[PDB]
Amino acid sequence: MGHIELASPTAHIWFLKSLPSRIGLLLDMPLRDIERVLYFESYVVIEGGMTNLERQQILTEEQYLDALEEFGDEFDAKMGAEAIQALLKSMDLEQECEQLREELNETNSETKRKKLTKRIKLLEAFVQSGNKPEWMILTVLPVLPPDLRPL
Amino acid sequence: YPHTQLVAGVDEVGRGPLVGAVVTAAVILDPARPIAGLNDSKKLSEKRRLALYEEIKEKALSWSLGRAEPHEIDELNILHATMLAMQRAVAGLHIAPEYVLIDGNRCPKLPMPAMAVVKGDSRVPEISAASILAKVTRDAEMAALDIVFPQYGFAQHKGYPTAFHLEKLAEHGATEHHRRSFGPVKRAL
DNA sequence: GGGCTACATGACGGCGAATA
DNA sequence: TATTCGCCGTGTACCTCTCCTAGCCC
RNA sequence: CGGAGAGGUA
């Protein structure tokens, strides 16, 4: 086999549109908004901490304008696959699971419980699985052997 | 809001941990000294959260802390120990509230009227302020216990039953602070 | 001698996660 | 909950005929 | 030695 070095990371379409979107429900973000930050038509705060901006927010071109008016030193905000990969890297797994676990018994809502338990089962299966969340973002592209794609 | 001026918000932390108290706070905010950027304590960065501590405590009309130790949790169970903690928090307020807003879906027995608010921490500034005070206090106690019992790593997992905490609980056994009624702690004992 | 650009619509059903 | 809109897929084995990605200069 | 379009036999 072979490989191709990619300058910029690329999100895998299978995990992007698995229906349900694994990345989308792992980050607890809607499909419409997650599919609007990877195409550079919007913006997103990459684990930034400011007065208003918290960890995750999809700012538009105009919102970024008045965001970057006075401040802009600590809180960062990237855009696209790099930001998504950094978000997947800088999110805890065991801690998030514990929190969700508790909010499972206290919560009385039905639909919420279903959505909560469907999230926690994926989180657990991931934690016993030997995979990493950032591996879902493709960075090196393997190539097929030439004989399997003859000319 | 109720048609009252002295509304207290109340929230809890440390429901699921295997170690230390359940901690609650009660807060009456000052309408003349509003606190900007109150929101669920979990969504806040640690720096911002601790920053609020010097604003909440300064700008609130009244605040207080109520706790329930591991032994009281083992005797009462976690639900009634949370209700007791909450009571103390509300009972510790210098200024008596006219009305109490509690995070979740149950109220403790109180001498004043009270309402349970589901996700009140995200909807009610006073419950958000209580969430921050309770969380910061609790997290500092887990850091203090980590200094005394460094082999458990209490500063990192804040006493929650993480794989690491369960491993260290099996290796070193349960400490006096370790809630003795929780299933993992019963097994280690 | 060298490097160099990448237009469709009659589809019958059902289920499921998305909203109304 | 019912309505909408998405994709899911829609038997099998043979026979004959014809027809398929090109683009920049000292 | 691959892929399309048309027609035909059970």
Q: What CATH number does the domain containing B99 carry?
A: 3.30.420.10
According to DSSP, the β-strands at A137-143 and A2-11 are antiparallel
Q: Would residue B58 count as lying in a domain?
A: yes
Q: Among B42, B55, B102, B162, which would you mutate to test the A interface (most chain A Cβ atoms within 10 Å of its Cβ)? A: B162
Q: What are the angstrom distances between the C-alpha of A21 and each of A13, A30, A80, B99, B174?
A: 10, 9, 17, 44, 41
d(CA B28, CA A33): 37
d(CA B104, CA B146): 30
Return the closest-CA partner of residue B17 out of B171, B122, B152, B172. Answer: B152
Where is B100: in which H helix or E strand?
A: strand B99-103
CB-CB neighbors (< 8 A) of A98 in chain B: 16, 157, 160-162
- How many separate helices (H) and strands (E) can be counted in chain B? 6, 5
d(CA B72, CA B157): 22
Nearest Cα residue in chain B from A127: B163
Of all nucleotides, the one whose C1′ comes closest to residue A114's CA is C17
Q: Would residue B2 count as lying in a domain?
A: no
Return the closest-CA partner of residue A1 out of A142, A140, A141, A138. Answer: A142
C-alpha dihedral over A53, A56, A57, A61, to 10 degrees? 90
Tell me whether A101 touches chain B (CB under 8 Å): yes
Q: Return the structure tokens found at A66.
A: 């008045």
Contacts of B188 (CB under 8 A, 6+ apart): B169, B170, B173, B174, B178
Of B45, B161, B162, the CB nearest to A49: B45
Q: Do A54 and B45 touch (CB under 8 A)?
A: yes
**Residues of B within an 8 Å Cβ radius of A:** 15-16, 36-37, 39, 42-45, 47-48, 104-105, 118, 157, 160-164
CB B21 within 8 A of CB B42: no
Q: Would residue B79 count as lying in a domain?
A: yes
| Domain enclosing residue B181, as ranges | 7-188
Residue appearing with tokens 């008596």: B96
Q: Would residue B43 count as lying in a domain?
A: yes
d(CA B158, CA B18): 9
Q: Among A76, A105, A106, which would you mutate to test the B interface (most chain B Cβ atoms within 10 Å of its Cβ)? A: A106
CB B146 within 8 A of CB B159: no
Residue appearing with tokens 């009571």: B87
Q: What are the angstrom distances between the C-alpha of A8 and each of A43, B64, B128, B161?
A: 17, 51, 40, 38
d(CA B178, CA B21): 9
- How many separate helices (H) and strands (E) can be counted in chain A? 7, 2
Three-state DSSP class for B58? Answer: helix
B165 CA to C16 C1', in Å?
39
d(CA B61, CA B27): 8
CB B133 within 8 A of CB B65: yes
Would you call the peptide bond into A145 cis, given omega within 30 degrees of 0 as the criterion?
no
Residue nearest to nucleotide D7 (CA to C1'): A19
**From residues 80-139 of A, which are strand D contacts by CB within 7 A?**
111
Q: Give chain B's domain count.
A: 1
Nearest Cα residue in chain B from A104: B16
CB A150 within 8 A of CB A6: no
Return the closest-CA partner of residue A1 out of A151, A130, A135, A149. Answer: A149
d(CA A128, CA A137): 20
d(CA B98, CA B110): 11
State the binding site of B: 11-12, 103
Strand C and A27 CB separated by under 7 Å: no
Give the DSSP letter string of A78-125. Answer: --SHHHHHHHHHTS-SHHHHHHHHHTTTS---HHHHHHHHHHHHHHHH
Q: Would residue B1 count as lying in a domain?
A: no
CB-CB neighbors (< 8 A) of B105 in chain A: 106, 108
CB-CB neighbors (< 8 A) of A120 in chain B: none
Structural Rg of chain A based on CA atoms: 18
